[PDB]
Amino acid sequence: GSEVEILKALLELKKSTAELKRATASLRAITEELKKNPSEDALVEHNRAIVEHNAIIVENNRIIAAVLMLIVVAVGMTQEIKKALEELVASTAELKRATASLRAITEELKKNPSEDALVEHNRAIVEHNAIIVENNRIIAAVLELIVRALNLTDAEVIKALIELRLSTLELVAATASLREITEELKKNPSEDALVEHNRAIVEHNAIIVENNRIIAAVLELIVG
Amino acid sequence: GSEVEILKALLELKKSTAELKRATASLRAITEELKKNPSEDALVEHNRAIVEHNAIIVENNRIIAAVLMLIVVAVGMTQEIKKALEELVASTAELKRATASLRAITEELKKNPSEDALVEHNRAIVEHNAIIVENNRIIAAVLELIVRALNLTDAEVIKALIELRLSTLELVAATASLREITEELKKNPSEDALVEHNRAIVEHNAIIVENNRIIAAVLELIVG
Amino acid sequence: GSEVEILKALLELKKSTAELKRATASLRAITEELKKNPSEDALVEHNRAIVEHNAIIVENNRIIAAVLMLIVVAVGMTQEIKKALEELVASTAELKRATASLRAITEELKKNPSEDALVEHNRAIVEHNAIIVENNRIIAAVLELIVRALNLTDAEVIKALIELRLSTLELVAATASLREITEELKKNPSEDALVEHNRAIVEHNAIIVENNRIIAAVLELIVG
Amino acid sequence: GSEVEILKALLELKKSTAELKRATASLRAITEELKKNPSEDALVEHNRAIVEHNAIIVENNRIIAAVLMLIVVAVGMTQEIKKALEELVASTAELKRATASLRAITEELKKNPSEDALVEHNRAIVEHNAIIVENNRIIAAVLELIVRALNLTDAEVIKALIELRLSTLELVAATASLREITEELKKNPSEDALVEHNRAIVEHNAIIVENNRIIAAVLELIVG
């Protein structure tokens, strides 16, 4: 793909440079030879027009190449985006499996409220949060790939990406804390440990909500 | 390149759709089963949070896919752009050759102002204008490819492209008229035919200037 | 066709320009000669009226040429449209043949439900979808030709065309995926492969429906 | 040009009609044969999707042909427009010659105010008005050609054209009256005849101004 397109852009720069050098040489040959006898009006006026036309063409070639380099840089990220998508697809499928599992657990817990079903409920919630964390990590990575691929410079998007990175650090640390709390609850289940675990979950969900808010802000800036 | 990236985007849409269907099924199973006994607070609150998280993830996947499709469409034009560049490079090289030829003719005409050298001058000028016309046709084509590749909707760029197309029609018709006038001058050279030819050249150059102005306006709109 | 009409428009521009230059020259000759003796009222008032009349005529010629250039640009696409129509006609005829084949297969399959008839049914469905994809590609191309020929600038039509291009990319990728799934079913037919294939068909039809919706929106915008 | 494009549109209508007939035949064969055994779900659902796809394609072909017929009708007027332009160009050139003649007369009359120069002045003014009348007749004709070529239905443009036709009748009658007055002045020149002639000129110019106002209104409606 871009391996050849870029080689052609380089060939274009070489040819427009050679054109510029030759057009400049005629510019000067014209001034020096025609000033000798201004009565040769057609020759000097035609050659000056030729020089202006070439100068414009060279400037246009420079601008066109400058734009195509942006298309080329977007093209060169095809494999990075493809891999980010493969990860996002696997994450989505895992999230779906966790949701179906949780639904089945909910039905079993309500129909037959065995303590084991409550344990399975909390386990499913922890798996779901781990999946959300992986999903948001993958999305943040794909957002960075999109921002880079589109060559965005908007200060608002850069700041939003910084906020996203910080919120993903907070989300990962909170996730690790939630997993440790769940394991401690499992080892020594109790009413106090269970209420502390439920509080840890509420705080974790609040963090996820903030992370999703930031992701939404980044997407809004990219789309709009 | 885009052949696989797009297949992955379609796979993502399939998976986010399956996730949405499953998240919806749990949304309803939760509401209907939990209203039976609101005292199971942890189960209903955790599952509602789960549903909100999935709904957000599905919406984000939709938006991300929508953006990546714009990158994919830009990527899919790689071969069209490569061919447009090959044409532009060949045109640039031909323009350079015409310029070098004209410079050599100018030097020969000034050093030895034979009538044959004036004839060669007018021939070189006509070849140069034919080259500009081919060059601007190629640039207009690459500009359309750029506008399509970047998915631009700005009304100003669309109008500028329309003006460009019209000016390229005017330029081609004027070029054909100039070639016919040159052939008539060559067949029956005279002072009156020569002055009419020089006027034809001035009008042609004015048309080229307008065509380049429009191209510059289009590039300004694309870059800025 | 347009080759001569445009040459005439250029001749008109040349003549209205010469008229403008001469009308301006009399404008000034009038001011300078008549201010010498304002008592020559009839001469100055008549010549001023003459100048205003010419200025109006020059402006009208400019506007008329500007409109006719839009008619000329629409005319110049005659061969591109003719070729797009030839493709659309061939596509329509092929779609008809596929439909008649499918009808005959349906009758044979219901009258004698041999497994081979089911295989032929799925083959006919795949051919039909391939035909729809070619038909919609051709229509999208003719829509672009119509939009360009009519010099439309409506932001809504430009956006609809962008959506169309993206949906045609999705449609082509889905079609390739459907063909591959059908080939895999043919090589290893089974109940699970057959149900997966039928699901692939349902998803493909949903994509076709969306592509047709976008095409309909574009046609609505062109007609209305 | 349009001779072939229109034949292709007719071929398209023939082929889309045949498609419609076959799609309808399968629609009915499907309903009647499948109701015999609704358990053949894949066959009935696939064929119903096939029928919907064909119905949509047929409606789209009808709409596309309806638009292309408007392009074809615009194309078919190429020779009428070309001839209107040839007339407008000849009119412009004649107007330029009259203007240059009037300028030379003005210079001669001011430099050497011979009675013969005043006679030539009034003659040149009458010729100029005759030229304006021919120019506006030609413009009104080209406006009618443009309105027909663009298939405009706007009530405002139709009314403006009616007003134009009426004003051109007034302009022609006034022109004939001015010519008769000029001939009477020439045969029996006098101060009273000269002042009556000058009044006739003022009234004629007022009529020309109104005719140009209407033409401008028509152009405004066509462009906007």
Numbering used by the authors:
A (entry chain C), B (entry chain E), C (entry chain Z), D (entry chain L): 1 to 224
Please give me the paper's original passages concerning this structure.
We then applied the filament design method described in Shen et al. to dock these connected monomers into a wide variety of helical filament arrangements and design the amino acid residues at the newly formed interfaces to drive assembly.
We used cryogenic EM (cryo-EM) to determine the structures of DpHF7 and DpHF18 at high resolution. In contrast with the near-perfect agreement of the DpHF19 design model and the cryo-EM structure, the structure of DpHF7 differs considerably from the corresponding design model. The pH transition is thus reversible, and the pH transition midpoint can be increased by increasing the number of buried histidines.
